Each structure stands twice: as structure tokens, then as C-alpha cells.
Scaffold this active site. Structure first.
Site, mmCIF file in Angstrom:
data_model
loop_
_atom_site.group_PDB
_atom_site.id
_atom_site.type_symbol
_atom_site.label_atom_id
_atom_site.label_comp_id
_atom_site.label_asym_id
_atom_site.label_seq_id
_atom_site.Cartn_x
_atom_site.Cartn_y
_atom_site.Cartn_z
ATOM 1 N N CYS A 161 4.136 -1.201 -7.281
ATOM 2 C CA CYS A 161 4.067 -0.422 -6.203
ATOM 3 C C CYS A 161 3.789 -1.409 -4.833
ATOM 4 O O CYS A 161 3.734 -1.258 -3.988
ATOM 5 C CB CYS A 161 2.795 0.615 -6.552
ATOM 6 S SG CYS A 161 1.458 -0.054 -7.493
ATOM 7 N N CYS A 166 1.977 1.020 -2.948
ATOM 8 C CA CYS A 166 0.312 1.014 -2.647
ATOM 9 C C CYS A 166 0.058 0.020 -2.479
ATOM 10 O O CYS A 166 0.948 -1.080 -2.058
ATOM 11 C CB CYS A 166 0.066 0.925 -4.021
ATOM 12 S SG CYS A 166 0.281 -0.364 -4.874
#
Ligand code: NAD
Length: 249
Positions: A72, A154
Site C-alpha cells: 500500500c 497508504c
């Protein structure tokens, strides 16, 4: 011509299938993937359906089969600079654009659509997002996977932007309209833009461009930090990427 846009790419089925096979041979995490199943799910999303009445639900079987966990924190988004973005991930194999996932790789540079009244693939013409209709097989696929890729991200999320566009950040691009608004504030610490210069002589600091201030403002409101870097010489950039253990890089 029914539609204004290009028809389905020649050899579309063979191409998706061969891309799937290639991808699943190269990427060990996707070894469980049955490419015939993938193809059947892909077809099922648009075959026999009106190419202006495609929904995200239509692509759910494909999304299911194409389920892939990408790191991520290693996501590279891009807008209007596809080629450099991919050249970069081909060398920096650490990082992933959407087209480095199975589903993005299958579909990249392809066009496809079907017809309502039949089960054939339309190689003659497909709806143009603009001159025809927005809920077409291609636009719906890209919006769906582009959203999901953004939702997956992320930490520090990077975005390559074309500093030669005059809307360096374009609110109306897929990056601008879908991905910016689907970065999860709970997960994404920073969006960092790499603004790629593309022209003559010594250039401005394009991170000060009004569209970049626009992007910064939008993302800041979403509680995500913004960073920006000029890449003044894309050629030297890539050369540095290809051999980073080298003075001058
Ligand atoms: N690989 C792709 O063609 C594709 C398409 C859309 C979005 N994306 C994802 O979104 C970002 C780039 O998209 P962008 O729009 O910001 O840059 P962009 O404007 O350069 O679009 C990339 C490509 O997708 C086409 N495209 C863009 N929006 C479309 C739409 N709504 N319907 C049909 N085709 C469309 C463009 O003609 C271009 O070929 C990247 O992060 C990328 O991973 C990828």
C-alpha cells in the site's frame, strides 16, 4: 459508426488472455489465477450489455478474480504522463502503478465494448466518454479499478504529473476526479507529486503552479499532507533510476 470512439482493439480477447498469461507467469502472487476465468469475467462485464449502461457491479466478478494485494505504501498514481510512470516502475520494481497490477495491465491501452442486441464484441466503434456517454465499458472499468487502487494506498502515495499540460493538476482527470477523492485519510499520510518537465531550457518551479496549489488545498482539506518535487530532466531522472549507485544522482 454507431459511436464516435475507436472500436474494440483488434485481437482484444487474445490480447487480454496473453497479457493475463504473461502477468501470472511473471508475478508469483497471481499464480492461482485462471486466465480463462479472468477473461470470462471480463467479457461478462460488457458483452450483451448496452455500452452506455455499464455499472461497477458489472465488473465485480472481474474485480473478484483480479483481487491483488499491492504494497500500500508503494503506489504511484499518475496523470497525463503514462509512459514515464511505466518506464519508472519497469525499473523501480519496488513501486506499482495501476497498470502494474493484473487488471490494469490487462486493460492498458485497450478499448472494448459490446452491443445490447447481441453477444458480439464491437470492433467497429465504442462510446467516447465525451462525444457519446460516460458509463461505457472502458470508462467504468478505469473508474472502478482506479478508485480501488486509490483506496488501497497508504503512507506516502506518489503521483507523477505532466508539467507541460497547463493544467498540471487537472481536477477533471481520473487522478483528479476519482483518485484524489478516494485516498483514505485514515491510511494516507502524504500525497507527493512529481511534476515532470517537458520542454526547452531552464524551467519554472512548477510546484508553485496554481493547479498544484489547487491540489494541495484539496488534499489538505481531506487531512492528507502534500509534498511536491520538480523532475526537471526526465531523461536524467530515468538514468538515475536505472543506476542509482552513481555519483550525480
Ligand atoms: N491506464 C489507463 O489508460 C488509465 C485510465 C484511467 C485512469 N487510470 C489511472 O488514473 C490515473 C491516470 O488517469 P488520468 O485521467 O488522471 O490521466 P489521463 O488523462 O492521462 O488518462 C490516462 C488514459 O486513460 C484515458 N482516460 C482518462 N479518463 C478516461 C475516462 N473517464 N474514460 C475513458 N478513458 C479515460 C485517457 O485517454 C488516457 O489514454 C493513473 O493513476 C492511472 O493508474 C489509468
Amino acid at each position: 459508426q454507431t459511436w464516435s470512439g475507436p472500436g474494440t482493439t483488434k485481437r482484444f480477447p487474445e490480447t487480454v488472455l496473453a497479457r493475463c498469461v504473461k502477468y501470472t507467469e511473471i508475478h508469483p502472487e497471481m499464480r492461482h489465477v485462471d486466465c480463462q476465468s479472468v477473461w470470462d469475467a471480463f467479457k461478462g462485464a460488457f458483452i450483451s450489455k448496452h455500452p452506455c449502461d455499464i455499472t461497477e457491479e458489472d465488473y465485480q466478478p472481474l474485480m473478484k478474480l483480479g483481487t491483488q494485494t499491492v504494497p500500500c505504501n508503494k503506489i504511484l498514481l499518475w496523470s497525463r504522463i503514462k509512459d514515464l510512470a511505466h518506464q519508472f516502475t519497469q525499473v523501480q520494481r519496488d513501486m506499482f502503478t495501476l497498470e502494474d497490477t493484473l487488471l490494469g495491465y490487462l486493460a492498458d491501452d485497450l478499448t472494448w465494448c459490446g452491443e445490447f442486441d447481441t453477444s458480439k464484441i464491437n470492433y467497429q466503434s465504442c462510446p467516447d466518454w465525451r462525444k457519446d456517454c460516460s458509463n461505457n465499458p472502458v470508462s467504468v472499468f478505469w473508474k472502478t479499478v482506479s478508485r480501488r487502487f486509490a483506496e488501497a494506498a497508504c503512507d506516502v502515495v506518489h503521483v507523477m504529473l505532466d508539467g507541460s499540460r497547463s493544467k498540471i493538476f487537472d481536477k477533471d482527470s481520473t487522478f483528479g476526479s476519482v483518485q484524489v477523492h478516494n485516498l483514505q485519510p485514515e491510511k494516507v499520510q502524504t500525497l507527493e507529486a512529481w511534476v515532470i518537465h517537458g520542454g526547452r531550457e531552464d524551467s519554472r518551479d512548477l510546484c508553485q503552479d496554481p493547479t498544484i496549489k489547487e491540489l494541495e488545498s484539496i488534499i489538505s482539506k481531506r487531512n492528507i499532507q502534500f509534498s511536491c518535487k520538480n523532475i526537471y530532466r526526465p531523461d536524467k531522472f530515468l538514468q538515475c533510476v536505472k543506476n542509482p549507485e552513481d555519483s550525480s544522482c
